[PDB]
Design an enzyme around this catalytic site. Structure first.
Site, PDB file in Angstrom:
ATOM      1  N   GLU B 114       6.099   1.001   7.816  1.00 10.50           N
ATOM      2  CA  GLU B 114       6.226   0.757   6.371  1.00 10.50           C
ATOM      3  C   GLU B 114       7.485  -0.023   5.920  1.00 10.50           C
ATOM      4  O   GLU B 114       7.340  -1.018   5.208  1.00 10.50           O
ATOM      5  CB  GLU B 114       5.958   2.023   5.506  1.00 10.50           C
ATOM      6  CG  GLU B 114       5.878   1.675   4.009  1.00 10.50           C
ATOM      7  CD  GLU B 114       5.437   2.840   3.107  1.00 10.50           C
ATOM      8  OE1 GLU B 114       5.203   3.954   3.633  1.00 10.50           O
ATOM      9  OE2 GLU B 114       5.333   2.632   1.866  1.00 10.50           O
ATOM     10  N   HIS B 128       6.735  -4.008   7.059  1.00  6.82           N
ATOM     11  CA  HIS B 128       5.819  -4.159   5.944  1.00  6.82           C
ATOM     12  C   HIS B 128       6.530  -4.418   4.609  1.00  6.82           C
ATOM     13  O   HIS B 128       6.112  -5.299   3.836  1.00  6.82           O
ATOM     14  CB  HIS B 128       4.874  -2.959   5.830  1.00  6.82           C
ATOM     15  CG  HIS B 128       4.404  -2.727   4.437  1.00  6.82           C
ATOM     16  ND1 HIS B 128       5.090  -1.921   3.553  1.00  6.82           N
ATOM     17  CD2 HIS B 128       3.343  -3.228   3.751  1.00  6.82           C
ATOM     18  CE1 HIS B 128       4.473  -1.929   2.384  1.00  6.82           C
ATOM     19  NE2 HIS B 128       3.409  -2.699   2.484  1.00  6.82           N
ATOM     20  N   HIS B 132       6.568  -8.120   2.200  1.00  4.14           N
ATOM     21  CA  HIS B 132       6.309  -8.333   0.775  1.00  4.14           C
ATOM     22  C   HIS B 132       7.352  -9.244   0.151  1.00  4.14           C
ATOM     23  O   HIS B 132       7.030 -10.134  -0.651  1.00  4.14           O
ATOM     24  CB  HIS B 132       6.359  -7.017   0.024  1.00  4.14           C
ATOM     25  CG  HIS B 132       5.045  -6.315  -0.015  1.00  4.14           C
ATOM     26  ND1 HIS B 132       4.139  -6.508  -1.033  1.00  4.14           N
ATOM     27  CD2 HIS B 132       4.479  -5.438   0.844  1.00  4.14           C
ATOM     28  CE1 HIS B 132       3.067  -5.768  -0.807  1.00  4.14           C
ATOM     29  NE2 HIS B 132       3.252  -5.125   0.327  1.00  4.14           N
ATOM     30  N   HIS B 168      -2.033  -7.028   4.228  1.00  2.00           N
ATOM     31  CA  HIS B 168      -2.535  -5.698   4.568  1.00  2.00           C
ATOM     32  C   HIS B 168      -3.613  -5.658   5.625  1.00  2.00           C
ATOM     33  O   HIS B 168      -3.791  -4.632   6.282  1.00  2.00           O
ATOM     34  CB  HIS B 168      -2.890  -4.875   3.326  1.00  2.00           C
ATOM     35  CG  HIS B 168      -1.695  -4.171   2.800  1.00  2.00           C
ATOM     36  ND1 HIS B 168      -1.236  -3.001   3.357  1.00  2.00           N
ATOM     37  CD2 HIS B 168      -0.761  -4.562   1.901  1.00  2.00           C
ATOM     38  CE1 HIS B 168      -0.101  -2.654   2.772  1.00  2.00           C
ATOM     39  NE2 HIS B 168       0.201  -3.587   1.891  1.00  2.00           N
TER      40      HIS B 168
HETATM   41  O1  CUO Z   1       2.239  -1.671   0.046  1.00  2.00           O
HETATM   42 CU1  CUO Z   1       2.151  -3.450   0.918  1.00  2.00          CU
HETATM   43  O2  CUO Z   1       1.843  -2.772  -1.132  1.00  2.00           O
HETATM   44 CU2  CUO Z   1       0.878  -0.737  -1.079  1.00  2.00          CU
END
Ligand code: CUO
Ligand SMILES: *[C@@H]1O[C@H](CO)[C@@H](O[C@@H]2O[C@H](CO)[C@@H](O)[C@H](O)[C@H]2NC(C)=O)[C@H](O)[C@H]1NC(C)=O
Ligand SMILES: *[C@@H]1O[C@H](CO)[C@@H](O[C@@H]2O[C@H](CO)[C@@H](O)[C@H](O)[C@H]2NC(C)=O)[C@H](O)[C@H]1NC(C)=O
Ligand SMILES: *[C@@H]1O[C@H](CO)[C@@H](O)[C@H](O)[C@H]1NC(C)=O
Ligand SMILES: *[C@@H]1O[C@H](CO)[C@@H](O)[C@H](O)[C@H]1NC(C)=O
Ligand SMILES: *[C@@H]1O[C@H](CO)[C@@H](O)[C@H](O)[C@H]1NC(C)=O
Ligand SMILES: *[C@@H]1O[C@H](CO)[C@@H](O)[C@H](O)[C@H]1NC(C)=O
Ligand SMILES: *[C@@H]1O[C@H](CO)[C@@H](O)[C@H](O)[C@H]1NC(C)=O
Ligand SMILES: *[C@@H]1O[C@H](CO)[C@@H](O)[C@H](O)[C@H]1NC(C)=O
Ligand SMILES: *[C@@H]1O[C@H](CO)[C@@H](O)[C@H](O)[C@H]1NC(C)=O
Ligand SMILES: *[C@@H]1O[C@H](CO)[C@@H](O)[C@H](O)[C@H]1NC(C)=O
Ligand SMILES: *[C@@H]1O[C@H](CO)[C@@H](O)[C@H](O)[C@H]1NC(C)=O
Ligand SMILES: *[C@@H]1O[C@H](CO)[C@@H](O)[C@H](O)[C@H]1NC(C)=O
Ligand SMILES: *[C@@H]1O[C@H](CO)[C@@H](O)[C@H](O)[C@H]1NC(C)=O
Ligand SMILES: *[C@@H]1O[C@H](CO)[C@@H](O)[C@H](O)[C@H]1NC(C)=O
Ligand code: CUO
Ligand code: CUO
Ligand SMILES: [Cl-]
Ligand SMILES: [Cl-]
Ligand SMILES: [Cl-]
Ligand SMILES: [Cl-]
Ligand SMILES: [Mg+2]
Ligand SMILES: [Mg+2]
Lengths: 655, 229, 207, 229
Positions: B114, B128, B132, B168
Site C-alpha cells: 500500500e 502504491h 498515485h 489498480h
Molecule cells: O487507493 Cu489507489 O486509491 Cu483506493
C-alpha cells in the site's frame, strides 16, 4: 466621443448592467429564452458571420472563422453613417456577440475609421485584466473586494511577483517570463494585429506582409537581447516538427467566463489537428509541403500565382512592382497570398497547432492554449521559437537578394560623431556618456473598468492591480553631421542596435549581426544647411513609439521595454547610424503608404561582401558605428555615493 | 477493478490493462474539468505522458521510477519465495493457510504494497501510494511550472481518472501473483454439511404492467438531485 | 547508331534525340608575368577556381576553400625571356579538356560544363594563379607518367598557417588572386540593348 | 584536461567531448586489465553502456541520474544569476573580483561541484564525486551481479579510463560556464611596470653531435624500471 470609449467597459457583463452603471439610454429590451437588447432584423441582416461565434470562448485571432467574424462585425461599425449610429449599433449588438470578438471589432474600428484615433482606445489591461493577471491574483482580488465592501472600504490594491508563475531555479525559460508576460508587450501584439489584420481588404494596407516580417523580426531580435542579458542562449527555431517541443508553458490565466486557458506540458509533439468537424482539419505534413513550396519559390526567385503566371521576387523592384519581402510575407502569414492552395497558411495555422497540442484530436473537450490568441501568445516561450522559424524563412529570402550597390548606399551627408546621454533620474548621480540603465519599477492600474467587483448594485468598490515592470531612464543622443555641398540637404537618420558579442563571448560578424539589428530611431530631419549640424533626439520621440501605467497609447512598442535589460557588469551594444538622402514604425499607418521606398530595416537586412560591421561602415562616410553600454540595476540607489566608512576594500582593484 | 471491467465489457470495451511497464508513456490522459472552492483548477494529464521521477521541493523529498521498480523487484522476490524479510532481520512466512495467531500472507503483502504497516519500509517501500503521486504529478514532475496536482493525488477524485484502473489493475496483478503461490483449497477446506439444491433470482416490481422474467436484471439511467448550499 | 528503329529490313528510318544542356560562351584569359632573372625561364601556370562565399554568405577561409578548388588550367608555357611576358589561353585549350552535340572526344571534362552555372545576379569566384618553376589532366595518359612531380592540385590541397587565401597569396610573388563573376542567363538575348520605350523605371537605382 | 587534449592533437585525435547528455550511452568502454593484490579483478565497462541510476545496497543509499541533473540545473542557475543560495537561506555572491575577506566565486563553485565544503549540499548536491561512482558501477548499476567497481571509482586508477576525461571535460565546462560570467580584466588589472622584450627557448644537450635549434623541444619513449618487491 468618450461615450464610445465606455463601450469597451465591463465586457463580461450585460448591456443593461453597463448602461445602468453609466446612465446610457437603452434601446428596447426583451427576455432571452434575463434582460437583453432586442436585435433589429435590419441590423442582424448586415452582420454576416459575426453572431456565429458562441459566447464563452476567447477570440482566436489566427483561426479563419473567428477572424472572419471580427471582420464582419467591424464592417458594420466602420460603415456606420456617424459616431452616434456607431454607438447605437454597438449598444444593440453587445448582448448578442462573443465579448472578445466584440472588443476586437471595436479596436479594429478605431484603426479603420478616419474619425477615430487608436490612441483614444482604453489600455487593454483595463478592459480585459484576466488576460494579463494570474488566476490566483484575480481570485484573491475578488476575496479582498468582498471583504472591503463589507467593511465599508472603497478601494483595494492587490499585487504579485514572477516567483509565483513558475520556478526560475528549475526553469531557465522562466528567467525571461517578466518580458514575455509584460502586459504592455502583449497589448502591443493585440494592437499590431488589429491595426494590420491578415484578413484586411488587399490594398487597404501598404506593404503589410513586409510589416508582418519587420515587426516580428524586431520582436524576436529584442527577445534575444533580453536572453543574452540573462545568460540564456538565443532562441532556437522550432523547424523540425518531428521533435517534441521541449519547453511547455502553464499560463495560469482564466477568462472572465471562468474558462481557464489550457496549458502545454514539457515535451509535447506538434500534431495534426483533427477538428470538429473533421473536414476542417489541418495536418503537419500539409504545413510541411506548403513550406517546401515556399522554400522552392524563394530559392528560384519567383512565386506561382493561382492564375498560373509567375511573380518575380525582388527587393530591388521596378516602379509599380511589389517588394519580394512583402510577397513572401503575404504568402507566409498568410494574408493576401498569391496562391493559398499552393503556399497555404503556415504561420497562422502553426499558432493553432501549438495552441491545441495538449488535445489535438479534440477528445477531451478542452479550451485552447495562449498561442491561439494575439493578446496572450507572446507569453509562451514557444511563441519565440515559432517566430524564430518564421524569421528564418524571411532571412532565407533576404539572403537571395544581391548586396546593396555603392549607389544604393551612397549619400551626400557625412556622419562625424555620435554621443548618447542618459537624462537625470536620481539626485547626486550623473550617468557617464554612452551608458544606459534598466531596472524594475512597480506600476498600478484600475481594473474596475474591466471587472465588476460589486456584490450588489449600490456597492462602491475599486480594485487596483500592482505589479513590477522592467523600466529605463529617459535618454537622448546627438548625431554630428557635415553637409559638404552648396545647398540644403534633407536626410533620414537610420539608427539600429545589436549586441556586440554572442553567448560565447565571440564578436559577431556582419552575417550574424543581420539576425539581431533592431530599430532604435528612423526619421527624417529638417533640411541641413551647408556645413556642420547637430541633431539631437530624445528617447520619447523614437519612431518605434506612438504619440499612467500605460505611457504610450494605441499601437506602440512598449516605452518601458525600449532599452534591452543589459547586465550588472554592463553589456556592450553596437549603435549603428546612417544618414541617407531623401504611429509606431512597427505598426505603420492604416490610411497612408510607407513613405520610404527602401526596404524596412535597410540597409541591415541584406548580405555584404564585408566580413564585419566595422568594415561595412568604414566603406561609407554616411555611416558611423557607435557603441553603448547597458547596465541593469538590481537596486537603482546603488549608483549613489556611499559613505567612506561603508565602502569595502577590493582585492583586485575593482570589486 | 472487477466491477469496472464488467462495466467495460457491457460497453464493448476491452478489459483494463495494467500499467506495469513504466517506461511506456500512459496512452490515455484525463482532463477532470474540476476546480476547488479556493479557485484552484485541478491539473490535467495529456495523452501519452510518461511516468517520471518526481523531483520534489525540497529535492531531498524526491522519489524515482527505478526506486519504485526496485521495491517491486524486492516484493516480487518475497512473494515468489514465500517470505518477507523483516526490518529486524528475521524472515516472515507468507501463507493464506496460517497457524492460529499467524498473520495472513495476503494481509502482509497488502501492508507492504500500500504501504501501511509494512514489515520493512526500507526494502519494500511505498509503491502504491507513491504511484498515485507520480501519476498525479506527471504533467509537471520536476515542479518547474508552479502547478497543482492531478486527481490521482486525492481519494475523493482519483477514481475519475481512467489511469486509476490501470494502476489498480497492476496492484491487483501483484495480489493475484501472490494468490497463485498458494496451494489449492483441500477437499476438507471446501467441504460442507449443507447441500445447495436450487437458486432463483427475481427482479421486484418497478413499472406498472411489466413483470420481469426470472433471472433477469435491468439497469437504466435516472436523474438525482441534491442541495449544494 | 545505337537502336535499330526499323520494323523490317528495308525501312529507312533515323531517330534524332534533342534535349537541353547547360552551356557557356568561349573565353580567354591573359596572365602578365615578369622574369627578373638574366636567362630564359620555363614555368608551369596553375590556375584554380572556387566560390568566394559559402551558402551563408560568409567569406570562406583558406581551410574551407581547400574543399572547393577545381582545376581551370594547368600547363607548361614556352620559355619566358628576361622581362615582362603576356600569356594568353583560350578556354578550348584547357588542360581539363581533351583534344557535334559532343564537342570533345575520348576522355574529357565536358566542355559545356566547363563553367559553373553561376547566378542571375552574378556569383563571385576566386581565380587563383600560380607560376611555378619547371589527354584531359583528369584522365591522364595510359602510356606515360604524370610529368609533374608535384601532387595533383598543388599547392591547394595542403593546410597552411595562413588564415585566408588572400594572406596565402600575398606571401608569394609567384601567386596572384584574381576574381571573376559568373552570371547565368535564363534568356541569353536579355544582354541586348532594349528599346528606350520598353525600359522600365527602377525604384531603387537598379532593378 | 588541457594537456590531455594536446596529447590527442599530437596523435591526430579529435579533442575530448564532454559527457553531458546523460541519456546517451557512453560510446567508448574500457577494460583496465587490472587485478588487486586480494585477487579481485577490476570491473570493466563495455562499449555503449548507459549512465544509470545506482540502486545501492541498502537501497536507501541510492542515487539517481535525474537527481544529479537537478543538482546541475540548480548550479547552472546560481552561476547564471551570479549567486548561490546558502543552506542558511542567505544568498552568496559569486565573483572573481572579490572584496577583501570575500571568497572567490570560482572557489565557491568548485566546493559546490566536487563537492567539498559546499554552501548547500541539499540544493547543489555532490555531482562530480557521484558521477565517478555512476560511471564506475555502470556495468552493474543495480548491484544484481555481485561485482566489483570499475577504475573510475578510485583516484589512483581513474585517469586510465577514457571516460575520466569525458567526465572532466563536462566538469571543466561547468567551470568555464562560470568563468564566462565574469567581466573581462580591466586595463588596471592587466597593467604592469615591467616590459617584456624577448623570449627564447633552448633544449639542453641530450645526445652527442646534435644541438637543437632554438625554440624546438622533443619527446620520445624511454624505458624505466622499478623494484616491485
Ligand atoms: O487507493 Cu489507489 O486509491 Cu483506493
Ligand atoms: C476605477 O475605474 C472605474 C472606471 O470604470 C471607475 O468607476 C466609475 O466611477 C465613477 C465615479 O464614482 C462612476 O460614476 C462610474 O459609474 C464608474 N464607472 C463604472 C463602469 O463603474 C472608478 O471611479 C475608478 N476608481 C478610481 C479611484 O479612479
Ligand atoms: C543516323 O545514324 C546512322 C549511323 O548508324 C546512319 O545509318 C547509316 O546510313 C547509311 C546511309 O544510308 C547506311 O548506308 C548505313 O547502312 C547506315 N548504318 C546503319 C548501322 O544502319 C544514318 O544515315 C544516320 N542518319 C543521318 C541523317 O545522318
Ligand atoms: C467611492 O469611493 C471613492 C473613494 O474610494 C469616493 O471618492 C467616491 O465618492 C465613492 N463613490 C460614491 C458614489 O460615493
Ligand atoms: C495573374 O495576375 C497577375 C497580377 O499582376 C497579372 O499580371 C497576370 O496578367 C495574371 N495572369 C493571367 C494570365 O491572367
Ligand atoms: C546628392 O544630391 C544630389 C542633388 O539632389 C542628388 O542628385 C544625389 O542623388 C545625392 N546623393 C549622392 C550620393 O550624390
Ligand atoms: C565626439 O563627441 C565626444 C563627446 O562629445 C568627443 O569627446 C569626441 O572627441 C567627438 N569626436 C569627434 C570626432 O568629434
Ligand atoms: C517620457 O515618457 C515618460 C512616460 O510617459 C515620462 O515619464 C517622461 O517624463 C517623458 N519624458 C519627456 C521629457 O517627455
Ligand atoms: C522481528 O519481529 C518479529 C515480530 O513478529 C519477531 O517475531 C521476531 O523475533 C523479530 N526478530 C528478532 C530477531 O528480534
Ligand atoms: C459437519 O458438522 C460437523 C458437526 O458440527 C462438523 O464437525 C464437521 O466439520 C462438518 N462436516 C462436514 C461434512 O463438513
Ligand atoms: C429451481 O427452481 C426453478 C424455478 O423456481 C425451477 O425451474 C427448477 O425446477 C428448480 N430446480 C430444482 C432442482 O428444484
Ligand atoms: C571551342 O569549342 C566549341 C565546341 O566545339 C566550338 O563551338 C568553338 O568554335 C571553339 N572555339 C574555338 C575558337 O576553337
Ligand atoms: C549564512 O552564512 C553566511 C556566511 O557568511 C553569513 O554571513 C550569514 O549571516 C548567514 N545567514 C544567516 C541569516 O544566518
Ligand atoms: C608600478 O609601481 C608602483 C610603485 O610601487 C605601483 O604603485 C604601481 O601599481 C605599479 N604598476 C603600475 C602598472 O603602475
Ligand atoms: C630575441 O632573441 C633572439 C635569439 O637570442 C634574437 O635573435 C632576437 O633578435 C631577439 N629579439 C629581440 C627583440 O631582442
Ligand atoms: O503572429 Cu504576431 O503572433 Cu505569430
Ligand atoms: O576527480 Cu574526478 O578524479 Cu581528480
Ligand atoms: Cl467530425
Ligand atoms: Cl523520469
Ligand atoms: Cl530544492
Ligand atoms: Cl536493499
Ligand atoms: Mg527544430
Ligand atoms: Mg554528451
Amino acid at each position: 466621443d468618450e461615450e464610445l470609449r465606455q463601450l469597451f467597459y465591463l465586457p463580461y457583463e450585460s448591456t443593461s448592467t453597463l448602461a445602468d452603471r453609466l446612465g446610457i439610454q437603452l434601446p428596447p429590451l426583451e427576455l432571452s429564452p434575463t434582460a437583453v437588447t432586442v436585435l433589429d432584423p435590419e441590423l442582424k441582416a448586415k452582420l454576416g458571420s459575426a453572431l456565429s461565434i458562441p459566447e464563452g470562448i476567447p477570440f482566436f485571432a489566427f483561426n479563419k472563422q473567428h477572424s472572419q467574424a471580427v471582420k464582419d462585425l467591424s464592417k458594420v461599425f466602420i460603415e456606420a453613417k456617424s459616431l452616434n449610429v456607431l454607438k447605437d449599433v454597438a449598444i444593440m449588438v453587445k448582448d448578442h456577440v462573443n465579448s472578445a470578438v466584440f472588443l476586437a471589432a471595436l479596436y479594429h474600428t478605431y484603426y479603420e475609421r478616419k474619425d477615430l484615433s487608436p490612441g483614444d482606445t482604453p489600455p487593454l489591461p483595463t478592459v480585459l485584466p484576466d488576460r494579463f493577471v494570474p488566476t490566483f491574483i484575480i481570485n484573491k482580488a475578488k476575496k479582498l473586494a468582498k471583504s472591503a465592501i463589507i467593511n465599508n472600504q472603497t478601494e483595494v490594491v492587490v499585487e504579485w511577483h514572477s516567483d509565483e508563475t513558475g520556478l526560475s531555479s528549475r526553469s531557465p525559460e522562466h528567467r525571461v517570463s517578466y518580458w514575455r508576460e509584460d502586459m504592455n508587450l502583449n497589448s502591443f501584439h493585440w494592437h499590431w494585429h488589429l491595426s494590420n489584420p491578415y484578413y484586411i481588404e488587399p490594398g487597404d494596407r501598404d506593404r503589410r506582409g513586409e510589416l508582418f516580417y519587420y515587426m516580428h523580426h524586431n520582436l524576436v531580435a529584442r527577445y534575444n537581447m533580453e536572453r543574452l542579458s540573462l545568460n540564456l542562449k538565443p532562441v532556437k527555431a522550432f523547424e523540425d516538427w518531428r521533435i517534441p517541443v521541449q519547453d511547455g508553458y502553464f499560463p495560469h490565466l482564466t477568462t472572465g467566463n471562468g474558462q481557464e486557458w489550457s496549458s502545454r506540458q514539457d515535451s509535447t509533439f506538434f500534431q495534426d489537428i483533427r477538428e470538429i468537424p473533421l473536414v476542417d482539419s489541418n495536418y503537419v505534413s500539409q504545413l510541411e509541403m506548403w513550406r517546401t513550396h515556399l522554400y522552392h519559390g524563394i530559392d528560384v526567385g519567383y512565386l506561382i500565382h493561382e492564375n498560373g503566371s509567375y511573380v518575380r521576387l525582388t527587393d530591388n523592384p521596378e516602379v509599380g512592382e511589389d517588394y519580394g519581402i512583402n510577397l513572401v510575407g503575404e504568402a507566409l502569414e498568410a494574408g493576401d497570398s498569391v496562391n493559398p492552395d499552393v503556399y497555404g497558411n503556415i504561420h497562422n495555422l502553426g499558432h493553432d497547432f501549438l495552441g491545441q497540442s495538449h488535445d489535438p484530436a479534440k477528445k477531451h473537450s478542452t479550451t485552447s492554449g495562449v498561442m491561439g490568441a494575439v493578446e496572450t501568445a507572446v507569453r509562451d516561450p514557444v511563441f519565440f521559437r515559432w517566430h524564430k522559424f518564421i524569421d528564418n524563412v524571411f532571412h532565407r529570402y533576404k539572403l537571395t537578394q544581391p548586396p546593396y550597390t555603392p549607389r544604393q548606399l551612397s549619400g551626400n551627408i557625412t556622419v562625424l560623431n555620435v554621443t548618447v546621454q542618459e537624462e537625470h533620474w536620481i539626485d547626486d548621480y550623473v550617468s557617464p556618456e554612452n551608458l544606459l540603465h534598466t531596472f524594475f519599477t512597480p506600476k498600478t492600474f484600475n481594473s474596475s473598468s474591466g471587472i465588476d467587483f460589486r456584490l450588489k448594485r449600490d456597492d462602491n468598490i475599486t480594485v487596483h492591480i500592482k505589479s513590477n515592470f522592467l523600466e529605463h531612464p529617459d535618454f537622448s543622443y546627438t548625431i554630428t553631421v557635415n553637409n559638404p555641398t552648396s545647398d540644403f540637404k534633407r536626410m533620414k537618420l537610420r539608427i539600429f542596435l545589436a549586441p556586440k558579442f554572442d553567448e560565447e563571448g565571440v564578436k559577431m560578424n556582419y552575417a550574424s549581426l543581420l539576425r539581431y539589428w533592431t530599430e532604435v530611431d528612423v526619421f527624417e530631419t529638417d533640411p541641413i544647411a551647408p556645413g556642420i549640424a547637430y541633431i539631437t533626439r530624445h528617447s520619447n520621440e523614437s519612431s518605434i513609439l506612438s504619440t499612467t501605467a500605460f505611457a504610450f497609447s494605441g499601437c506602440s512598442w512598449p516605452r518601458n521595454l525600449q532599452v534591452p535589460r543589459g547586465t550588472q557588469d554592463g553589456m556592450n551594444f553596437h549603435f549603428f547610424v546612417m544618414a541617407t538622402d531623401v504611429s509606431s514604425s512597427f505598426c505603420g499607418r492604416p490610411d497612408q503608404p510607407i513613405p520610404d521606398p527602401w526596404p524596412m530595416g535597410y540597409p541591415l537586412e541584406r548580405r555584404s561582401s564585408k566580413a564585419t560591421i566595422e568594415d561595412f561602415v568604414d566603406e561609407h562616410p554616411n555611416m558611423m558605428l557607435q557603441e553603448v553600454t547597458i547596465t541593469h540595476l538590481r537596486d537603482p540607489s546603488s549608483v549613489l555615493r556611499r559613505p567612506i566608512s561603508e565602502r569595502k576594500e577590493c582585492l583586485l582593484f575593482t570589486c
